[PDB]
Structures are given as structure tokens and as C-alpha cells.
Nucleic acid binder design. Structure first.
Lengths: 363, 363, 363
RNA sequence: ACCAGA
RNA sequence: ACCAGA
RNA sequence: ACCAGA
RNA sequence: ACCAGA
């Protein structure tokens, strides 16, 4: 029986994360200065004016790659006291150097904001192609109370964080799903229902989160910082960690649903010998998933190299069995597109057959 | 059998609370000064006058967000000696900074109360839209005896704490349920039956408890402080912990009733293989429920991010089975609305069928 | 079988008493000075005169809340040497501060008693609405022998302690039950049969014990001190612990009779699966009942928050089965009112059917 | 909450 | 999220 | 890569 | 040495 433990150790080394800290520092890329307009000063009034001048900055076809990513990092961190020590706390991206600039309110400037460069800010912040709210009776969302801005900012962030859930997996067919979360935070009284940003504003951001990678690394790594906050989180931060249950494991559902339907049901069609090698390369992917730490449900949001390893192509037979168990059990699995060049529908029909045979067949 | 314990550890890490104390302090939100008018001095007379001038403050359409929340925190803590060291004892909310001000009685002021700012208090405390008692022959509820005020304050609090039970779950259809608790504390002689605040006063408060989150964090976290009081509690505090049995787990009844009817009855339709994966993701939610501590029955009152995890959408088949067992056993389960996009009524009809088949069928 | 012990631990934590000593001291209510006229000096004569001037104080419509409760605490502790070190020994109520004053006899005062304030006592102690004995040929019950006063005080206390048995559960229909205990202590020669206080005197006290809560906490917590007295108790104290067998568990008979008829009979209709979940939430209420200690039969006399947990609404089916077994077995169960909004008479008729089927049907 | 209990 | 619970 | 998830 | 592998 010496072949067995020599086989299991063979799959616990080729299916092992490589050890690190071997690069001396000659892998770091050419940097890229990005511009994140942080809120200026203690006062609430200028950070509501900053949010107003930076939401309509995004709804603009004339904004670039870095100017839009720095605009989003500028508004995804307005919910904290002193956002400057949050951006440099979170960003460990090696391709983007944060050069973040303070924005203070003024009555001299055209937009109303200067940089702490009085009119140079007006070329930073400035009709049928400007993205804005759906109730476009709105002109400005500048307020002066703290709990007003806390509910407006919580409304704007709650429909940028739900973009992250399927900006990279189902970008085009995300419009119906993300509305069902907007309905969720409206009846929870988390957000205000009036201030729904339109299809064209969100399609700027959803296309942006999909097309660059350092914006997603900022959006993921602050979520991981929200989770570590021990006590009662602040209420926008609780909302971001509430949206997070839709963002985790988003793009690993050829692996999560393989576990949920192929493994956990335990039909008699797992003792097939053709699965016996593929239950071990799925056992080792569950050992690998929990030793990657808290960055493991985001491996395809962060789009690292290790999500090729959790792909269903390494277990093409036991995955198809789990799609057969999956679409026969739930109504919700009927909408899942599983179109791959390794499908083998003879085990998909064997997956459905074990469910239909075991209808009233208590084990 | 190495796949089995590798599977169970996989569900005891993705269904695990994240470890904390990783934020250095850069998550804390922008603060918000709130105004909680605490009772002034040792004497009973000014805290009955404070209760009188602050109940009718709430029945007013001209009061704001923070002024109403500070009015409620002002009256939900009048039942203790020195309420100032209760508010700063309870409030660990990061979005609200308590600036609490002492209120002393006077004969110079219009309302009768000054701040320890003689007439500035009159703009703080001051007909068919002013909410007040149903027997609106009442003008004032200022008294001078201690046991009188102890019964009037116990009457006002006992119909604010029953608002919390379903302010966030069934806000609109709470009017018939909360009356059945008002009838309970009338025949127990806990409250006085005359001083029933009307529909329009309570709909200010029930809408308030629903729409902001730092008021609920104060209402929850003093309940958790009432429970820790070892000996005989004071009688208003015993009443709050008595109302508490209706506030606990309020919004988790897709999980509590899944345990009560799906699990604990133990019909032969739990050995279905389609439930075998969903009895383990319900076993791990019972491990998670008791290691969250004493803040776990209030997770949807506090509206944290972990009540998405106890949702019935993660076990959509075994939940529907338990609604089928549930509505067939009790008359009371017929009023429960369970309308979700994952219902699958083929197991709801299988849930009813196991009850009807097992009518006189002792195991 | 890992779901089973994970289920049983889930019900031994949500159905668990919360741990205590977490309040630093900021729960304690506003105090309330009460006036308990203790007997003055060693001599027997002034404590018989104190009892005389304080029984007719209670039969008076002009006495208040605190003056009546302090009058009752004044006479419920006359049976001990030095009653002053009994009141401050018993009262751990946080809402009532005992300010107890010594009463000495005199020939200068109108009532005959001064305070150790010669005429100020006459406004403390002073016809068809004055409650007094039924044989209202009696003018005074002042005596001079010790065994005379020991039998008069034992007569007055034995019809105040039987008020406590159902002052809070069946207040209105207690007049026929409490007479059957007065007949019991008359043929035992415990009391004197002549000195029966009338309906109108006792309806002052029974309404008082029902309407305030700190009087019941004094009446309960001295009963618990009577029980701890090791040797032969004094004879009035033996009588109070003799009345106590009617005061214990008074208001828990939807739980005691559920145990007595539903559980202990062990008909074949307990192996129903619909009861199998409700025999475990009744098993855990028997674990909870004996770890609450010696204050557990008085939880609804003390009216704490934990008697909502022993309510029949948490086991609405197995309770109705036990009312069906109950009213079919005894004549005495026919008088029990069990009218609740969770009755489900299909198991009440199933409860009666198991008794009628098992008539001469020895197991 | 409601019965009977020397 | 929605029932009943002295 | 694609579903559903108060 | 030769396949497939978001």
C-alpha cells in the first residue's frame, strides 16, 4: 500500500501554492500615478460637495482610465474619517502609486472645490450622454447635515459595490440581478429609493471595474479591511460587508456548485472509479481553498493565476455530474450557463438520472 | 473516507466568522453629534416634567432625524438613577457621538425646563397632527410621587420597546400584534391601561426605529445590559427584558422555524440525499449562531452582514420542506408570509405530505 | 449523527439563562422611600397596639400606594423579635429604599402610638367603607398576653399570605379558593375562626399585591428566608411556609400540568413526530427550572422575564394534548380556564381520546 | 395568566 | 425580511 | 467565466 | 514529444 500515500503526496505538491519571498524586488512593475481626490477637512459640507462633483464626473464620456479609477477610489472611501490614511492603508497594488490630493470647498472656484490650483481643480471636475440619477429632476445632491450625507453616500456606494459582484463574470447580464439587490436595500431602509443612478452611469463603472485590475484590488482589499473591524461597524461599512455576500466566490461556481451538488448529496454515483481520481483533485482544492486565507473567495475578482487551478477543466467529469444534479434540483440552476469545451453530457445525463431515480428514495 | 472530513472542514471555514482586530482604526466613519436630553438632578419632579415635554416632542412632524433619535434615547433611559452614565456606558456606535445635555426644571422658561440657555431650551421642546395619548382629555402627565412616575414611564417605555420587535421585519402589519402585548401588560398590571399612545405617535417611532440604525444599536445594547443585571432587576428594566422575548430572533424565522419543523420533527423525509448537503449547511449555522454570543438573536435588528448567511436562500429546499411541515401543524403558521424567489413548492407539498401521512403514525 | 448533538446544544443555549454581573451599576432605578412602621421595643403590648392601629389603617380608601405597602411590610414582619433587622435582611429590591421607623406606645397620642413626632404619628395611623373584621362587634384587638397576640397576629397573617397565592393569576375568582384555606387553618387550630377579615379589607390587599411589584418581592423573599430556617420554625413562620404550598408554581400550571398529564402518563401519543421537537423544548425547560434555584416556583409571582419562556406558546401542541389528558382524568381540571390564541383543539381531542381508549388498558 | 391540593 | 408566543 | 441568495 | 484545461 505504498503506492497510495506516494500518490496522495504527489497531488499535495503539484496542487500546492508555491513558496514565496524569492524575488529580491526585481518583479515590481513600472508605476502609475493615479489621482484620488480625498475629502478636504473635518467638515461634512465639503465632502458632500466632493461627492456631488465626483459622481457627475464619472457620468462623462471624456474621462480617462486613471481619472475614472481615481474618481471611484475617491468616492469609495468618503465614508471614513480621514480618507487619506485609508487609501495608503489599503493599496498594496504594485502597478499603481496613489498620489492623493486634498479637496477643500471654496466660493471662488466654478465647481466650488479647490485643491489644498484654484482654477486647476475646475479642469479636474469639468447632456443626453452625462450619466446621472434616474429621477433627473435632481440637479445637486449637496447637503449640510451629517445624517443626510450618510444616507446619500450610503446610497451611491451600495450601487457601486453591487457592480463588483458580477462585473467580471456576467458583465452584460448583470442588470437584472443587481436590481434585485437594490430592491433589497430599499425595503431594509439601508438606502434611499429615489437616488437610483441610471443604466448609463453604472455601465461606465461596471465597464471600468471589468477593464482595469487595480480598481478591483482596491475594492477587494478594503472589503477585507471591513471584515476585520471588530465591533459594531459603521453603517456604510456594514452595508459594504452586507453586499459582500454576493461578491464572495463570484466566478468559482463551477467549483462551489460542484461541491454543493456533486459531493454533498452523496448519491451512489460517486463510487464510480472514473470519479475516484477526481474526488481527490477536488479534495486537494478544498485544502488549497482554505489555506489561501481570506483572499480566496476573491481569486477571480482579483483575477490571480490560481483560479485556473479551481477550473472545472481539471475535473471535467465530476463537474458535469454536479451540473446534472444541480439543474434537476433547483429552479435557480436553470439560468446558469455552463458552456465549456469539456462538458461530456453523458455524465450530465447520469447526473440527472441519479436525482430522478432517487425521488422518494430515503437512504 | 478522507473526503468527508476534508468536506466538513471546508464548510467550517467558508461558513466561519472572520477574525477581527485587523483594522488599525481607519474604518471609523464621520461622526454625528446627537442630542440626548438627560434628566436633571436627583429629584423625581424634573424627570417627570422631562418625560412630559419629550413625549409630545416626538408627536410632532417638525422634528428631524437626530432630534427624534436623541429624544428617544432621552426617554428610553429615564428609568435609571443618573442616565448620563448609562448612555456613555451603552453606546459603542461608531457613527454617533453622544453629546448629552442636562435638563433641569425651572419656572422662568415657557416649557418649564432649562439646560444646565434658558430660552434656548424652548426651541428644543417646542393640533390634529401632534401625536399624543388616545384618551386625549389628557393635557399633561407631570406627577410628583416616585411610584406614579415609575408607572407612567413604565407605560411609555412598554409601548416603545414592543415597537422594536417588528419595526424592521413587518413594519406595516405590526399594529395588530403590538396590541396583543399591550393587552398582556395591562392584565399583568405592568402598565396603566389609560395611557395608550395613539397610532400616529407610534408610527413616528416605528418609522424612526426602522429608518435609522444607531437607534436600534442603542435599543439592542441596553437590552443586553438589562440581561446582565444579576439580582432582582428594577421593575421597568424587568419589563424591558420581558418585552425582549418578542424581540429576540425577530427576522430569523426562516431559520428558527426551519430548525423547529424541518429538523426537530424528524420525519423520514430528511434522509433524502438532496437534504443531506443542506442539513450540514444548517448544522454549521447552529454552530455559528451560538458562537456569535448574546448579540446573535438581534442580528437583523442590528442589521449586520451575517444575517445574509442565515437566509433561507442557502438552503432553499430544506427550508421549503419546513414551511410545509410548519403550515400544516399550527394555525399560527398560516399567517406567515414566505414569499421568496427560491421557494420550490414541490418540497412544500412534500413537507405537507409527511405531516398528513404521519397523522396517527407513532414512530 | 452529528446533526443531533449539534441540535441539542442549539437548544441548550437559546434556552439558557444569560450570564450576569456585566452591569457595572448603571441599571439601578430611581429609588423610592417607603415607610415601614416597625414594632417599638421589647414589650409585647406595643406590637399588639401597632397591629391594631395598622390593620384598620389598611381598611381605608384614603391610603396611598407607598403607605399601604409599608403598612403591609409593617405587619408581615411583626412575628419576629426585632423586625428592623428582618426588613433590611430581606429587601434586595432596587426600586424601594426602606426607611423604617420605630413605633412606641404612649398615652399622650390620640391613636396611642408615637415615633421614636408625637402628633405626627396620628396623621400616619388616621364607616361603611372602612375594612375590618366580619364580626364587626369588634372594636380593638389590642391584647397584653404574648400567646394571645401570637394567635391574633397568626390569624391576620394567615389571610394575607393566602392572598399571595392567586393575587396575580386569578385575582377576581380567588374568593372561593382562599376560603377553603381559611377553613383549613381553622380546623387545624392554627388561627382563630372569629377574626376573619372581611371581603372589603382583603380586596384592598389583594388589589395591592397585584398592582405593585416590590410588595411581592418582599413577600416572596421572606418565604425563601422561612424555608432556610433549619430547626423547628416559630409557629407563625411555620404557618407561612404552610401557606407556601399554595403559592409555589402559581401561574406555571400550563407547564406543571403539561408535565403531569402530557409527559408522566406516557400514552402512546408521545411518539408522534410533531411532539418530538416539543418534548425537547420541554426537557430543556425542566433543566432550566431547577438551575434557577429556589426562586423558580415564584417566577410569575415575582413576574420576572423568564416566565415568558415557560409559557405554553412555545409548545402549543403538546400543551393542548396535556389539557386533553388533564380534563378527562380529574374533576378538578374542569375548572381550569385555558383560553389562549394557540390552543389547536385537534390535539385536545386527541388528548381526550388517548384517555378514553386507555380506560381498562393496563400497559 | 386562571384548576385542585391538612 | 414578514407567524404565534403572561 | 456566467445561477440563486434580507 | 503531441490532448483538454477563465
Amino acid at each position: 500500500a505504498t503506492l497510495l500515500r506516494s500518490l496522495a503526496l504527489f497531488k499535495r505538491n503539484k496542487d500546492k501554492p508555491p513558496i514565496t519571498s524569492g524575488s529580491g524586488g526585481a518583479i515590481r512593475g513600472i508605476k502609475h500615478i493615479i489621482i484620488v481626490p480625498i475629502p478636504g477637512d473635518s467638515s461634512i459640507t465639503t465632502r458632500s460637495r466632493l461627492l456631488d462633483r465626483l459622481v457627475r464626473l464619472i457620468g462623462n464620456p471624456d474621462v480617462s482610465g486613471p481619472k475614472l479609477t481615481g474618481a471611484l477610489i475617491g468616492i469609495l472611501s468618503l465614508f471614513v474619517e480621514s480618507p487619506g490614511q485609508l487609501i495608503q492603508r489599503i493599496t498594496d497594488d504594485p502597478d499603481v502609486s496613489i498620489r492623493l490630493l486634498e479637496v477643500v470647498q471654496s466660493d471662488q472656484s466654478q465647481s466650488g472645490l479647490t485643491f489644498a490650483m484654484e482654477d486647476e481643480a475646475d479642469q479636474y471636475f469639468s447632456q443626453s450622454r452625462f450619466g446621472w440619477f434616474e429621477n433627473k429632476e435632481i440637479s445637486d445632491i449637496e447637503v449640510q447635515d451629517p445624517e443626510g450625507f450618510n444616507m446619500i453616500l450610503g446610497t451611491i456606494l451600495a450601487q457601486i459595490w453591487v457592480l463588483l459582484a458580477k462585473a467580471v463574470t456576467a458583465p452584460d447580464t448583470a442588470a437584472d440581478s443587481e436590481l434585485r439587490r437594490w430592491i433589497k436595500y430599499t425595503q431594509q431602509r439601508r438606502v434611499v429609493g429615489e437616488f437610483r443612478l441610471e443604466r448609463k452611469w453604472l455601465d461606465v463603472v461596471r465597464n471600468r471595474i471589468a477593464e482595469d485590475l487595480s480598481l478591483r484590488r482596491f475594492m477587494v482589499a478594503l472589503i477585507l479591511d471591513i471584515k476585520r473591524t471588530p465591533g459594531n461597524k459603521p453603517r456604510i461599512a456594514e452595508m459594504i460587508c452586507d453586499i459582500d455576500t454576493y461578491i464572495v466566490e463570484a466566478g468559482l461556481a463551477s467549483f462551489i456548485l460542484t461541491i454543493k451538488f456533486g459531493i454533498e448529496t452523496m448519491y451512489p454515483a460517486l463510487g464510480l472509479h472514473e470519479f475516484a481520481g477526481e474526488l481527490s483533485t477536488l479534495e486537494s482544492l478544498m485544502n488549497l481553498y482554505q489555506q489561501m486565507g481570506e483572499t480566496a473567495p476573491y481569486m477571480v475578482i482579483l483575477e490571480n493565476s490560481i483560479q485556473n487551478k479551481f477550473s472545472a477543466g481539471s475535473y471535467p467529469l465530476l463537474w458535469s455530474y454536479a451540473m446534472g444534479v444541480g439543474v434537476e434540483l433547483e429552479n435557480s440552476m436553470g439560468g446558469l450557463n455552463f458552456g465549456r469545451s469539456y462538458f461530456d453530457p453523458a455524465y450530465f445525463r447520469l447526473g440527472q438520472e441519479m436525482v430522478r431515480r432517487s425521488a422518494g428514495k430515503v437512504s
